[PDB]
Amino acid sequence: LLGVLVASSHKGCLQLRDQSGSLPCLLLAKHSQPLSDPRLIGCLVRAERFQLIVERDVRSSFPSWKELSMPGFIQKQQARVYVQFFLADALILPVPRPCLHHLGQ
Amino acid sequence: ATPSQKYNSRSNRGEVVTSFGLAQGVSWSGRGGAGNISLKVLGCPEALTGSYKSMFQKLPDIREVLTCKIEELGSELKEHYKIEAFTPLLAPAQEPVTLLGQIGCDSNGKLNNKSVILEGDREHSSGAQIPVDLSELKEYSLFPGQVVIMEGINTTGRKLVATKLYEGVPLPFYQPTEEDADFEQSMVLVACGPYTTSDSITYDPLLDLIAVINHDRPDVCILFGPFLDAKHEQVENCLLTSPFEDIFKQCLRTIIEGTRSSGSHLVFVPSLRDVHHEPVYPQPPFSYSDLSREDKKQVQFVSEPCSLSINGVIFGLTSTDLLFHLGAEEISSSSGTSDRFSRILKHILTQRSYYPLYPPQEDMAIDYESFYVYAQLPVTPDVLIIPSELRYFVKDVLGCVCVNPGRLTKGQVGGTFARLYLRRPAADGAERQSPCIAVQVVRI
Amino acid sequence: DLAKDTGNFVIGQILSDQSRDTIVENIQKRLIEIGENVLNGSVPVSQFEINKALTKDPQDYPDKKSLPHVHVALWINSQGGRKVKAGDTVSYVICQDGSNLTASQRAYAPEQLQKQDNLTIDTQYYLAQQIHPVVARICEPIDGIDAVLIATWLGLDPTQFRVHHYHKDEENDQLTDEEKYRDCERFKCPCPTCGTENIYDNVFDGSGTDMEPSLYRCSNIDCKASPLTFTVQLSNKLIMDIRRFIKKYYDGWLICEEPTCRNRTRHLPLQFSRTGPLCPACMKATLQPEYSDKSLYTQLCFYRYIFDAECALEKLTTDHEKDKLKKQFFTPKVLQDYRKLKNTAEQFLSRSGYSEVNLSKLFA
Amino acid sequence: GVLNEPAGLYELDGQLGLCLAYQQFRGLRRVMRPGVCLQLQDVHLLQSVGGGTRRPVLAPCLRGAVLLQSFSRQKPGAHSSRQAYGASLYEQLVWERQLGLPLYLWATKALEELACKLCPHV
Amino acid sequence: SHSYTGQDYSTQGNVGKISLDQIDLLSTKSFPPCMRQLHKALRENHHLRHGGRMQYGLFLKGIGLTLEQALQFWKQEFIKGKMDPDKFDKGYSYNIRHSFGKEGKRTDYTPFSCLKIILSNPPSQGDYHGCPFRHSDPELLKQKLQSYKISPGGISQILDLVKGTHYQVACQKYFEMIHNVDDCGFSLNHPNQFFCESQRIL
Ligand code: SF4
Numbered sequence A: 001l002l003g004v005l006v007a008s009s010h011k012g013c014l015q016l017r018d019q020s021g022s023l024p025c026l027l028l029a030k031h032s033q034p035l036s037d038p039r040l041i042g043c044l045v046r047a048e049r050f051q052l053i054v055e056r057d058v059r060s061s062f063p064s065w066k067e068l069s070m071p072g073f074i075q076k077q078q079a080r081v082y083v084q085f086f087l088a089d090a091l092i093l094p095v096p097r098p099c100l101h102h103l104g105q
Numbered sequence B: 001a002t003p004s005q006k007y008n009s010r011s012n013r014g015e016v017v018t019s020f021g022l023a024q025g026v027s028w029s030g031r032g033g034a035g036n037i038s039l040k041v042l043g044c045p046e047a048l049t050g051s052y053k054s055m056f057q058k059l060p061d062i063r064e065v066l067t068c069k070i071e072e073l074g075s076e077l078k079e080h081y082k083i084e085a086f087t088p089l090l091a092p093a094q095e096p097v098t099l100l101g102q103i104g105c106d107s108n109g110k111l112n113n114k115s116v117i118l119e120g121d122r123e124h125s126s127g128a129q130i131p132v133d134l135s136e137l138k139e140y141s142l143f144p145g146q147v148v149i150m151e152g153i154n155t156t157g158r159k160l161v162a163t164k165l166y167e168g169v170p171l172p173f174y175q176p177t178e179e180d181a182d183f184e185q186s187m188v189l190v191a192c193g194p195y196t197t198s199d200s201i202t203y204d205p206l207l208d209l210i211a212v213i214n215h216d217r218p219d220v221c222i223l224f225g226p227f228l229d230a231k232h233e234q235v236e237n238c239l240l241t242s243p244f245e246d247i248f249k250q251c252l253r254t255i256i257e258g259t260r261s262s263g264s265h266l267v268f269v270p271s272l273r274d275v276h277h278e279p280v281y282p283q284p285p286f287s288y289s290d291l292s293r294e295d296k297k298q299v300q301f302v303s304e305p306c307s308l309s310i311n312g313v314i315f316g317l318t319s320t321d322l323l324f325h326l327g328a329e330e331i332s333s334s335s336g337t338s339d340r341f342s343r344i345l346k347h348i349l350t351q352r353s354y355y356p357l358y359p360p361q362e363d364m365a366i367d368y369e370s371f372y373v374y375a376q377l378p379v380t381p382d383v384l385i386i387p388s389e390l391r392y393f394v395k396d397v398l399g400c401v402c403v404n405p406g407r408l409t410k411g412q413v414g415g416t417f418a419r420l421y422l423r424r425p426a427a428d429g430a431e432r433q434s435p436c437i438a439v440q441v442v443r444i
Numbered sequence C: 001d002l003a004k005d006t007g008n009f010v011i012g013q014i015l016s017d018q019s020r021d022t023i024v025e026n027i028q029k030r031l032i033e034i035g036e037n038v039l040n041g042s043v044p045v046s047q048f049e050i051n052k053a054l055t056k057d058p059q060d061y062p063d064k065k066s067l068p069h070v071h072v073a074l075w076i077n078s079q080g081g082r083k084v085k086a087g088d089t090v091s092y093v094i095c096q097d098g099s100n101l102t103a104s105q106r107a108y109a110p111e112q113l114q115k116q117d118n119l120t121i122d123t124q125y126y127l128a129q130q131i132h133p134v135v136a137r138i139c140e141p142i143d144g145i146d147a148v149l150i151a152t153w154l155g156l157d158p159t160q161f162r163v164h165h166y167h168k169d170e171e172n173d174q175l176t177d178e179e180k181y182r183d184c185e186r187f188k189c190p191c192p193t194c195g196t197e198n199i200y201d202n203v204f205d206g207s208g209t210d211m212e213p214s215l216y217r218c219s220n221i222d223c224k225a226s227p228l229t230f231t232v233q234l235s236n237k238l239i240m241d242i243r244r245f246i247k248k249y250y251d252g253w254l255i256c257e258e259p260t261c262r263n264r265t266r267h268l269p270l271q272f273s274r275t276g277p278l279c280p281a282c283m284k285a286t287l288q289p290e291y292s293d294k295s296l297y298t299q300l301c302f303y304r305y306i307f308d309a310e311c312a313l314e315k316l317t318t319d320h321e322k323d324k325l326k327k328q329f330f331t332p333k334v335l336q337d338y339r340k341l342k343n344t345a346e347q348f349l350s351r352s353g354y355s356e357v358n359l360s361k362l363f364a
Numbered sequence D: 001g002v003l004n005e006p007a008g009l010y011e012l013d014g015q016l017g018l019c020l021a022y023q024q025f026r027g028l029r030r031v032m033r034p035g036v037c038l039q040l041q042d043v044h045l046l047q048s049v050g051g052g053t054r055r056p057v058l059a060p061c062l063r064g065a066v067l068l069q070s071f072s073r074q075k076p077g078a079h080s081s082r083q084a085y086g087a088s089l090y091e092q093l094v095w096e097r098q099l100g101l102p103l104y105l106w107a108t109k110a111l112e113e114l115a116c117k118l119c120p121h122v
Numbered sequence E: 001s002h003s004y005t006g007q008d009y010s011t012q013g014n015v016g017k018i019s020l021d022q023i024d025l026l027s028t029k030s031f032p033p034c035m036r037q038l039h040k041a042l043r044e045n046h047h048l049r050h051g052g053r054m055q056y057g058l059f060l061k062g063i064g065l066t067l068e069q070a071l072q073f074w075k076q077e078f079i080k081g082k083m084d085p086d087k088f089d090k091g092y093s094y095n096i097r098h099s100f101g102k103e104g105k106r107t108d109y110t111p112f113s114c115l116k117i118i119l120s121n122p123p124s125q126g127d128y129h130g131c132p133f134r135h136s137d138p139e140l141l142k143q144k145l146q147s148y149k150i151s152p153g154g155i156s157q158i159l160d161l162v163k164g165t166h167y168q169v170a171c172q173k174y175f176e177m178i179h180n181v182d183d184c185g186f187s188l189n190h191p192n193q194f195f196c197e198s199q200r201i202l
């Protein structure tokens, strides 16, 4: 896994971001003391031994136990997905802006 | 549980329900595969080694084959029947007049006793048709495809009325040598398909069968298909979570394996439903490519149909539904007492075919331009086996041996299987001492 | 009377030297008017008399229920104290009753037509079987003015009618891909889970850069099962489908040609002529197969088409589209599954019918 | 074969995957195009190796240098700008960490996919 | 040897989209003699026989304009020549529309190829459909072609091949001259391919 970790003023949650899009992820700063460090916001990030998780929900209406191989009783298939992984093994880097190289309380 | 529940609780196993012949007991037994096992698939017409090469016909050659059939048959009959000559069918003349032709329907489907129509060969009568009727006549039995001689009185030309219907003739059976077949008693069992109650996939009846097999040690058994019907509800909803050839392979492997114990021969009769095998007729022998090498000595396939030779005795091997079909069309004026079966047997005898019904039933596809050269009766045979959907029975008819074995599994319930004995004498007599010794229809 | 006299004027039209344009014009306005004058119900029942003959007792016919007139004989001899027998005729008409039954039996003596209420004499049938076919016999092969056009002058009932084409004489004038197939039957498919149905026409599913493989996702927007993962099940239907097409052919119907007679049977008669054999009734006409082998082979090509994506993939022009889609989702697995089913099809036709031409008999 | 358009890794037969490893072939980096036919001797064929491919890998231990005897009349296009500009890093990449060559090809692939994922919109 | 080409290059629905007005403008520089002369004719007459249009008609699908647009074009050229504004619906326009319908497949659903406007369809008196280089009698045709401002030497070397009864090359040399380019770029077989070329060079 690799991308840039970005937050949003509209989902207020993790999102691994790339040109192709984004994904909801779940960092873990180890020993149940999680990340409060906001410098990692908007930076290149990488991880290897991860967990990819999917959640399945369905609107089933099966009548009995001998039609369990018979299609008539299933309508909605909602699918959630997200990444779960430790921060303690993070590979990190900032973005050197590729360019044409008192006040405040 | 629910598979074979209604089946496994049968109360009739081993029960001898009907049989015929000399006196023979219960504990039937044979020499397994001991030595003298005469076996061959004969034929001056070949026995269908390979496959066809046909998916398309050519019309006028059909006419050709119809013709050749009509001609050859008529000629061979007229030889014996010492009659002079027939008539171009449209020169009306009020005398006795003998005609040759084949019978057919005028209309779409079935018949009556008032719509038989006749058609003649290509040559003898210039090839045209004439309506008929037989009201004046007395006793007949007709059905499409059937070629026959007739006699009537042609008044108007485009009409006629019958006077008489001379009788068909069988050919003399194989009259074999007198040094080869001097053999002993012999047991053969046989059973058709399908192979379950039409809701499961268990082959429980196949288990019971192979049990009986291992029990009684037979010379050779032969098991008609169709080992997986298509009209079997479990299939035509596109259910089975598998390929098909695989299932064929499995439900063959089980048989060959369990059998290899009791050292007996097996031969297979394919039919028109084992969906992995294309549905044409006649049928090439099954395909198969994984033999326990030591058994290419024992088990051989055959084509559908075929004609097999054991100890110099003959067998007609059909995997059709013939008897039901011919039941579905025939007409006979006879109304006092008549075994419908006996008659249809007598017919199937003489026409040299396996399917003299023509036009064919709305499904039982065929293809003449090989059918005539691959599956015509090489000899009037001795024993004939024929599946059905009709109640089992057995008949000795005019030096011919026939048995309706019935099905194995009548829908969801028990069924039948056929068993018989063979031996030939070693002197003269009525010259056709039945090589069939005695026959038992033993219920499952 | 209506059909007979209509066609009689039709043929009478050609019998003068007006312009081909005048020919069309006159043979057009009259047609449209004739269609409408009943299409808006403005002609008496007297103008539809259907007198037909009789040969035997009504029950004699092996069509106990399968002629559009014998049913009335059944009626007349089973309902009243009035006899009808050999050598008699029936002056009836076909009449809809709003009952979605065959036209084979909604036949009626018109005296009840003028009596009851729900006896709606069917003014649909009387076009595709009385006016049109009569006009076809004669007016058809005129230049430009072709079959369906006549149809679309009276009643736009094309789809059903579209199947009739006189499609044996298109030789007087090598084919693009699709309309080598168009008139075949598509591949329909049952979904194993969502319950819906599908149709599999071309490998790619539609639009350009968006294009995706057929077997990927069930069509029904919501459900998310992916039918590919049921290759084997598809396999089944494939065979369990083809094993009825062949079923038809070797059982091939036989049908008539002279566009009036229209007989259907199988008992091949024995006389012969240039084109082949001759109907027994319309002794002045040929006979044709129904499922012309050309169909059968066409259809099997149509199957083998949409399972062999490899070809259509290779024929694709734009580099980047090809590379991107292949990068996307053409594993060895997906490919292999196509390969499997396509293989089943192709071998099952090339088994033995038609792709061969035995040169060893063609140059002797 | 134009394997890495930026780093101009080039092979013949379409199927002799080849990379000018150590030659500082500045001149042979903005010139080539399909239509050139050249000569060569004694360069390894890597097969029965796998790990990336089993194709006829060409490995130039610099014994038989490039043998220029032909050109290819072909003017350039208009797109390579976004898909070739900047491969200079490659030039020391081998000399960077003494790169094994199957490793080298794998790394090139990784860089391909990277560039697809990030460069240059970020 | 009949009315199929090598294959259907200039078939249904190839590259093209152009508004009505421009047609005439393009005519003077892009219409192969057969078409060009027929379009002049219908520019004058504003009426045509039963068969005639069924060449020009399908030829227009060469550039492939929309029916209602093509219908509008033909309407202009119809009622200005006094064709009853009610007949149009149930008459010509009807089949003109159907020309993109169900049946017509390989009969109407296709454009024409010279080997269909030559080997058949005899053109009758005062009519215009049909290959000039075949049906137009020689010296009348000489002055006729010359009326396209052509050097008589080209006309002569052309009429030579014309009596050599091989004509495609004649059409070819004509185009070669009238655009002066010293390669034919191809071996012409279909007027619409000719058209796609003539538009290519612009
Ligand atoms: S090439 Fe044929 S269609 Fe074209 S202008 Fe010449 S004769 Fe007419």
Ligand SMILES: [Zn+2]
Pocket: C191, C192, C193, C194, C195, C196, C218, C219, C220, C223, C225
């Ligand atoms: Zn679904």
Ligand SMILES: [Zn+2]
Pocket: C256, C261, C262, C263, C279, C280, C281, C282, C283, C285
């Ligand atoms: Zn007829």
